C-alpha cells in the first residue's frame, strides 16, 4: 500500500491505491482501501488487509451506536480515540496503519494511526510501503491554502508516485472528499491509469478439448 | 435480606406435587388446542390460534407450529415467548448433533434434551418453569414417524395421537374413538380438523384461526418433506373435508 | 403487600418504591430553579443552614461535575453525593473513551438509564433525588436536563424543583407566555442570575439575604458557583431597581 490524506480550505481529502499482495504476488488488483467509519468520517488503511477492515468496521459500528445514543453527528477524535486505544491494547499485533479523516460539527480533521497506537496530526500525511514516494511529492508540492481541486490533484499525484515507484502499490487511485457543509463524495477508481492492453490472441478452447470421465446433475433444491 | 420475597418455585407440596408445574399446566390448559396425529405414511400437526382479530396478519404469522430441523417440527401450547427460547435451544442442539456425528438427530434424543432442560427449572435455580407444552412431530430412520409431548415438568411420552392446550379431555376422547392403526395421512388430516371443530370454544372453525402442518414421505423416494400450510391451503383442506 | 417494598408492579401497574422515592426528593425542603440566558445557564437553589454549629461553606446541593457541567440536586445529601460522584466518574470516562467533553444531555440520559435500572432490578433501591444538569453545550447552546427516580429525563426551557416548585413553574410559564421566546434575552450572566432570583422572590413571596441562596452559572467552557459576596453584589443590583 500507498495511502494519503490532505487538508484544504473547507475540508479534507484522502486517497489510496488499489493493490493487495501476498508476498510478490498481486492477490487483488482493485481492492478498496478507503473505509467508511460514518457517513462523513472515512479511513484510509494500510498493513494487514483483514485487520484494517475489521478494526475499521468495529469502530464504525460502535460509532453508529454512539451517534444514535448521543443524538449527535459523530466526531473524528472519537473514531481516533477508539481506534488508537483498541490498537494499543493489542500491542501492535493488529497490523492496521490508518489515515483517519472527516468533517463533524467541530470542523474538518486529518490524523494518522500507527499499529502500536500512536497518533499524528497534520495538513498532509501518507502511510504504507509507498509512503516515501507519496511524501516526496507532498513535501514538494504542498502549500498552505489549497482549494478542493488542488488537494484532490495533490493527493492523487502522491498516490501515483507510489503506484509507479513502489512495487507494493499499483493499479488504480481511489479518492474520498469530505467538505464542510456537504455530503462526503467517494470517488471509487477516480483514476485508472493501468488498464491491461489487449491480449494478442484468444485462448477460448475448441469444445471437447477437455477429457471427461463422469457427469451428473447436482440437486440444489429441497 | 432477600429471602422474604422468594416464592420458592422448586419445592414440593405436602402431597408431593410441584406447585409451579401444576400452575403452569393450569396456564397451558387455556391455550389454543394443538393436536398431533400419527399415520403409517406420515404425521399431521393441527393447532388453533388464540382468538384472532380480523386485522392480524394471517399469512406471515407463526404462533403455534415451528420447524426444528428438516425432519422435525413442534406444535406449541402455552406462552409463545417461553416456547421460542426453548425452540432456539432445540434448533442448536440438532445442529450440534449433526456437526458431531454427520447424521440428523434422532427425534427422541432431541425430545429428551428439551425435556431435561425443562426438568432443571423444576429442581434447581429458583426460577419459574417454562409455561409450555410441545407436540413433537418428527421422522428418523430408526423409528420412522414419531409423536411426542413434553410439558413444564420435563416429562415426555410418545403417542399415536395426542392433544395439548384447551379441551384435551374432550379432544382425547374423540381421537380415541375414531383413530385406528392402519390409518393414512389424509384420513388423519380429516380427523384432526373434525376434532378441533368439535372441541373449539369458537362459533365455527375457519381458515384464519388455524395452523396446519404435515410430515409426509411425500417427495421423491425414501425421503421426507415438511409442509407448513399457507392460509389458502388451510382454506382448501377445510373445504375438501366439508367443515366450511 | 410486598409489592410495595421492592420495585415490582402493583396490581394497578405502579411502582410504589419509585413513588416514595419522589416523596424523599422534598425531604430537605429546598426549592431550586434553572433558566437559560443567551450565552449562559443559571441555576439557583435555596440554602438553609438551621444549626448554628454547621460550617455554612460546606452546606451545598450544587456540584461541579465537569469543567463544563454543573448539577443541582433536590433530595437528601447522601443520595445527592452518591449521584454526583457517579456523574463525575462517567463524565471523566466519556472524555477518555470518546475524546470530547460529555454533553449535559448525554450525561443526563446516562444517569437516567442508571436510575431506570434501580426501578427494574430488585436488589437496588432508587436514589431519592432529582438531578438538574446545566451547561452551555458546544453544539446545543445553553442546556438544562433533569433526572428523577423514575428514570425519566427531558430538556427544559427553564425548570424548578422542590416543595414550592409548582408556584415557581407557573411564574416562569407566565413570563415565557409574555416574552414569546425560549430564554432570558440578556447579555450578561450577571443579569440572568438577577432575573432568576427576582422571579424566585415573586413566586415564593420571600426575601433573601446573601446566605439564603446558592447560585451556579454555566458559560462556554466553564461552570462555576458564586460566593456570598458575588450573590450580595447581585442582591444589591436587584434592590436598586
Amino acid at each position: 500500500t500507498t495511502i494519503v490524506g490532505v487538508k484544504f480550505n473547507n475540508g479534507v481529502v484522502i486517497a489510496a491505491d488499489t493493490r493487495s499482495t501476498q508476498g510478490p504476488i498481486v492477490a487483488d488488483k482493485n481492492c478498496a482501501k478507503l473505509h467508511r467509519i460514518s457517513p462523513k468520517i472515512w479511513c484510509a488503511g494500510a498493513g494487514t488487509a483483514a485487520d484494517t477492515e475489521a478494526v475499521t468496521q468495529l469502530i464504525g459500528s460502535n460509532i453508529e451506536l454512539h451517534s444514535l445514543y448521543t443524538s449527535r453527528e459523530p466526531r473524528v477524535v472519537s473514531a481516533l480515540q477508539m481506534l488508537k486505544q483498541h490498537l494499543f491494547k493489542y500491542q501492535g499485533h493488529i497490523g492496521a496503519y490508518l489515515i483517519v479523516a472527516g468533517v463533524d460539527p467541530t470542523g474538518s480533521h486529518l490524523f494518522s494511526i500507527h499499529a502500536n497506537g500512536s497518533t499524528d496530526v497534520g495538513y498532509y500525511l501518507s502511510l504504507g510501503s509507498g509512503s516515501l514516494a507519496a511524501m516526496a511529492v507532498l513535501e514538494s508540492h504542498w502549500k498552505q491554502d489549497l482549494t478542493k481541486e488542488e488537494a484532490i490533484k495533490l493527493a492523487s499525484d502522491a498516490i501515483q508516485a507510489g503506484i509507479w515507484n513502489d512495487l507494493g502499490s499499483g493499479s488504480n487511485v481511489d479518492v474520498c472528499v469530505m467538505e464542510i457543509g456537504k455530503d462526503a463524495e467517494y470517488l471509487r477508481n477516480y483514476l485508472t491509469p493501468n488498464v491491461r492492453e489487449e491480449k494478442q490472441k484468444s485462448y477460448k478452447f475448441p469444445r471437447g478439448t477437455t477429457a471427461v470421465l463422469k457427469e451428473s446433475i447436482v440437486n440444489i433444491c429441497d | 435480606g432477600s429471602r422474604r420475597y422468594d416464592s420458592r418455585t422448586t419445592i414440593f407440596s405436602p402431597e408431593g406435587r410441584l406447585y409451579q408445574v401444576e400452575y403452569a399446566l393450569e396456564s397451558i390448559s387455556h391455550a389454543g388446542t394443538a393436536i398431533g396425529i400419527m399415520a403409517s405414511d406420515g404425521i399431521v400437526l393441527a393447532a388453533e390460534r388464540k382468538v384472532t382479530s380480523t386485522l392480524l396478519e394471517q399469512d406471515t404469522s407463526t404462533e403455534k407450529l415451528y420447524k426444528l430441523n428438516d425432519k422435525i417440527a413442534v406444535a406449541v401450547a402455552g406462552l409463545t415467548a417461553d416456547a421460542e427460547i426453548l425452540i432456539n435451544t432445540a434448533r442448536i442442539h440438532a445442529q450440534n448433533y449433526l456437526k458431531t456425528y454427520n447424521e440428523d438427530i434422532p427425534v427422541e434424543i432431541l425430545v429428551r434434551r428439551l425435556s431435561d432442560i425443562k426438568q432443571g427449572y423444576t429442581q434447581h435455580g429458583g426460577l419459574r418453569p417454562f409455561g409450555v407444552s410441545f407436540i413433537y412431530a418428527g421422522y428418523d430412520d430408526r423409528y420412522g414417524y414419531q409423536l411426542y409431548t413434553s410439558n413444564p415438568s420435563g416429562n415426555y411420552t410418545g403417542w399415536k395421537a395426542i392433544s395439548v392446550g384447551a379441551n384435551t379431555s374432550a379432544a382425547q376422547t374423540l381421537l380415541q374413538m375414531d383413530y385406528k392403526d392402519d390409518m393414512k395421512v389424509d384420513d388423519a388430516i380429516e380427523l384432526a380438523l373434525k376434532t378441533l371443530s368439535k372441541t373449539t370454544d369458537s362459533s365455527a372453525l375457519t381458515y384464519d384461526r388455524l395452523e396446519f402442518a404435515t410430515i409426509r414421505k411425500g417427495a421423491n423416494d425414501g425421503e421426507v418433506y415438511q409442509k407448513i400450510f399457507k392460509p389458502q391451503e388451510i382454506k382448501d383442506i377445510l373445504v375438501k373435508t366439508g367443515i366450511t | 403487600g410486598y409489592d410495595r417494598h421492592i420495585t415490582i408492579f402493583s396490581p394497578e401497574g405502579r411502582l410504589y418504591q419509585v413513588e416514595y422515592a419522589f416523596k424523599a426528593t422534598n425531604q430537605t425542603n429546598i426549592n431550586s430553579l434553572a433558566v437559560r440566558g443567551k450565552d449562559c445557564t443559571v441555576v439557583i437553589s435555596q440554602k438553609k443552614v438551621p444549626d448554628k454549629l454547621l460550617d455554612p461553606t460546606t452546606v451545598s446541593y450544587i456540584f461541579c461535575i465537569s469543567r463544563t457541567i454543573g448539577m443541582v440536586v433536590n433530595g437528601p445529601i447522601p443520595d445527592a453525593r452518591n449521584a454526583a460522584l457517579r456523574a463525575k466518574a462517567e463524565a471523566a470516562e466519556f472524555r477518555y473513551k470518546y475524546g470530547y467533553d460529555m454533553p449535559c444531555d448525554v450525561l443526563a440520559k446516562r444517569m437516567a438509564n442508571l436510575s431506570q435500572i434501580y426501578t427494574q432490578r430488585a436488589y437496588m433501591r432508587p436514589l431519592g433525588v432529582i438531578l438538574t444538569f446545566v451547561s452551555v453545550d458546544e453544539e446545543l447552546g445553553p442546556s438544562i436536563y433533569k433526572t428523577d427516580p423514575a428514570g425519566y429525563y427531558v430538556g427544559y426551557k427553564a425548570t424548578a424543583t422542590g416543595p414550592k416548585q409548582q408556584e415557581i413553574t407557573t411564574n416562569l410559564e407566565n413570563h415565557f407566555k409574555k416574552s414569546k421566546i425560549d430564554h432570558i434575552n440578556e447579555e450578561s450572566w450577571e443579569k440572568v442570575v438577577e432575573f432568576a432570583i427576582t422571579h424566585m422572590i415573586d413566586a415564593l413571596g420571600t426575601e433573601f439575604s446573601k446566605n439564603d441562596l446558592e447560585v451556579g452559572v454555566a458559560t462556554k467552557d466553564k461552570f462555576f458557583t458564586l460566593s456570598a459576596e458575588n450573590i450580595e453584589e447581585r442582591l444589591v443590583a436587584i434592590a436598586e431597581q
Partner: protein, 196 residues
C-alpha cells in the same frame, strides 16, 4: 527525541524538538511532544510515541477526575500518577517523561521519570536521545532564578545543540511557558536556531 524542562523566576518552561522517527525515516517532522495533562501541568514525552501518548491520556483522565473531586492537583501529584503507571508497567513501557507544572504556593516544579519509573525532583531536567550531547552544556550554563528571556535562551541554545548532534532529533523547537500569567506557546524554526 531531545526534551527539557527548566524552572525559573516566574514559573517553568518546557522545551522539545519535533521529530518522530521510525529508524532513520522521519515519520513526523512537526510533532508536538509537549502535552497538557492539566491547565498548568504539562509533560515532555520521549521514547515510544504510542506508550507515552497512552500514558498521558490516562494521566489526563486521572487528573480530570481528581479535579472534579478534590480541586486542582499539585504538580507532585501529577508526577506520582505518571510514576505509578511507569513503575508498575515497566516491563511493557519505553517512556522517558518529564513532568512540569506551576502552583501558586510552589511556583515552578520539574519532575523527571526515566525508564524504570523512578521519580526525581530537579531544578531542571533533560531527557531523550539528544540529551546526552548537552549534559556538559546545560550543567555549565544553568543558573537558578533566571528570567523568562534567559530561560528561553537557555532552552533554545541547549536544544539547538541536541538537535545538531542527534540525528533522531530535529525540526522546530517548541516551548511552553507556565506562569501565574497563564500559558504561552513558543515555536522556533531551523533558520533561527541552527546558526546560534
Amino acid at each position: 527525541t531531545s526534551i527539557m524542562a527548566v524552572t525559573f523566576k516566574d514559573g517553568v518552561i518546557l522545551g522539545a524538538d519535533s521529530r518522530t522517527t521510525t529508524g532513520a525515516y522521519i515519520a513526523n517532522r512537526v510533532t508536538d511532544k509537549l502535552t497538557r495533562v492539566h491547565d498548568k501541568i504539562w509533560c515532555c514525552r520521549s521514547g515510544s510515541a504510542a506508550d507515552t501518548q497512552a500514558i498521558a491520556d490516562i494521566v489526563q483522565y486521572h487528573l480530570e477526575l481528581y479535579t472534579s473531586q478534590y480541586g486542582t492537583p499539585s504538580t507532585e501529584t501529577a508526577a506520582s500518577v505518571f510514576k505509578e503507571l511507569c513503575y508498575e508497567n515497566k516491563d511493557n513501557l519505553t517512556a522517558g517523561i518529564i513532568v512540569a507544572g506551576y502552583d501558586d504556593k510552589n511556583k515552578g516544579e520539574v519532575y523527571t521519570i526515566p525508564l524504570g519509573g523512578s521519580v526525581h525532583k530537579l531544578p531542571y531536567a533533560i531527557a531523550g536521545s539528544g540529551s546526552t550531547f548537552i549534559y556538559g552544556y546545560c550543567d555549565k550554563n544553568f543558573r537558578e532564578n533566571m528570567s523568562k528571556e534567559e530561560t528561553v535562551d537557555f532552552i533554545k541554545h541547549s536544544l539547538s545543540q541536541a538537535i545538531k548532534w542527534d540525528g533522531s532529533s530535529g525540526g522546530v523547537i517548541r516551548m511552553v511557558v507556565l506562569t501565574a500569567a497563564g500559558v504561552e506557546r513558543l515555536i522556533f524554526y531551523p533558520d533561527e536556531y541552527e546558526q546560534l
